[PDB]
Amino acid sequence: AMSDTLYIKMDQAVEITKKQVTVGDVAKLQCKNKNITNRLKSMKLLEDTKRYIVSIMKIIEMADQTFQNVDIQNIGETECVVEFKTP
């Protein structure tokens, strides 16, 4: 019986030019099991069409909803301001 440990360090603020912001645009990830971070890196958090705050709990809900035996350890911020450029 093996649980994967996922380490999350979210940024405080992020400037984004893109159409979509993903978990990886917002936080650095580490897991020994790369299937975990590869999937989570790319998951849509939100799509552009000014600034949107992301809660760590949203990312955790997502990981818990996506993955089987993955417990999370939060290393970083709990709230993050994403601001879209291209004005």
TrEMBL record:
The chain holds residues 1 to 90 of 208 of the full protein. This is Stage V sporulation protein AA. Residues 4-86 form the Stage V sporulation protein AA domain. It comes from the Bacteria. The gene is spoVAA. Signal peptide: none annotated.
